[model samples]
Target: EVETFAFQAEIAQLMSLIINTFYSNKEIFLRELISNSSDALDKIRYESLTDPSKLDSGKELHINLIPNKQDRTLTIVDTGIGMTKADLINNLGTIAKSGTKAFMEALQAGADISMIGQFGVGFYSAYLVAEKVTVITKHNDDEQYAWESSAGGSFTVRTDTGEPMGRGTKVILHLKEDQTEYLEERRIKEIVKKHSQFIGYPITLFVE
Candidate 1:
């Protein structure tokens, strides 16, 4: 079953700001996404400390970058704490409604909010270079779900029938025509090295 939702007023405005205002630094999209995946991986590892069962057997903690030049899409896959259906909506849809409102206020004031992750707005930066974004996530306690958006006023969520992921999330970005630079292995390596080189988990990119 697939259900669609309109973005909250604040979320709509925020997304517009991110997509249009951040044009100069579109490459930050990869940095922001990798940071998010790193956080998710951290969450699962921390949870496993108290509940070992949360760590699925044989699923190594890592992030994979798959750039498909033929399809013009870049996929970020992570073995981490995946989100439930509600999580997909609330986390991806609402944008911590109140926090996002505050973020907008700060932006208007010209605050130097260099760390976008702190405001929970980093995820939306995917819109900086992607025409469409799709997320397929599997939580230990919930069925796999897929979320999609075109950075318009709304998004859709539905049950995913693909082969079940052992555990974690996959974020696929359908790059905009001019943003295909992200599809290059050299560019991805440079971005990862420049920003996420010190990240705890391994971030591997498919070469050919």
Candidate 2:
């Protein structure tokens, strides 16, 4: 179990403000995550042609969705090339300090929403709809673990309480009342392509 990391009060407050304000388009979050997943799957799909050992998602890569209204939870899951522990820290934490700036600079330089995933705050945006978020991941090389947070400040990282995922990752969003649109299967599919259709992977939609 890792120690709980709290966000600086200023950062915490700033995050909530983004939730309620800056991030007006909730569907963008899905686009960003799917884009990232496409990159990951593309990475291993290319590598597996040479190094079959590199394929993490059984040589077939795809994204999955499962929403639970009983618990008001929605999950975005993927199986592709996975990340390491340091990868988690860097991708999810402070390494993104310049992400927003760089992203905007790219846009001013003519970038697109495809560029948004490069910043990493995509994960935190789950909080825009979720009161709590949980990430359960298994790296290609490290043991599995679960990370939890309210996205106000820092988060808690701990060992898994769920069944082990072979080589990919699942992001669970404990949804809020206002963001229930994500629970709609048709909406999920629409948003997937509305933002990431060119993402080089077939983002399958499953209401089941």
Candidate 3:
């Protein structure tokens, strides 16, 4: 069985706004994504400190950037805390904020990345450059799963049959025609260093 949900009316409008407005600075998508990756690592590391085994006995926390120009795709992989189906549903489908227009206005005014409770819409920024986005993730408590969307108004999530992500999340962005610059290694490294170098975790840029 396949599971899918519609984005809230406000949520859809906000995402549409982000897609249209961020063209000039679409590179900011990498910053938003890396910031998210760091946050996920921070959460799991804090949990590990208290329990000692929360990290599967000292798993390495790193962020990987894989760019494939032929595939027209860029992937951000983090060996950090992953999400379950419920997490995907609640995080991607719901606005979890106030009305969309108000949030859109705040974003236009020059706000930084906000995640969870405030303006967790950072994930949607991926759509600014991607024609489609696919996320494969795993949590210790749940089986691995994949979530995909095109920022159209709905998204789908389902169990993944491929190899496990070893307890983390991997987000793949299928770049649009005008966004191919993002698939260049030099471009990716420059963006990462400029915006995400201080994330306190190793950011590896992988190319093939």
Of the candidates shown, which would achieve the greatest TM-score relative to the real structure? 1
For each candidate, give its TM-score against the true structure: 0.93, 0.81, 0.89
RMSD of each: 1.8, 3.5, 2.9
- Per-residue lDDT tens digits for candidate 1, residues 65-157, read 999988999999998888989889986523567767778778778753345666887888788889999999988988899999997899999
Clash-forming residue pairs, model 1: none
lDDT of each: 0.84, 0.69, 0.79
| Model 2 regions more than 4 Å off | 7-14, 101-115, 118-120
Best by lDDT: 1
Model 3 lDDT per residue over 1-208, tens place: 5688897777777667767653466687888888878888887888888886777723899999999988989999998788877888776433455635556666568753342124656777788789899989887778889998888899888899777677888999999998899988789889988877789999999978
Residue runs of model 1 more than 4 Å from their true location after superposition: 93-95, 112-114
A best-first ranking of the candidates according to their TM-score comes to 1, 3, 2
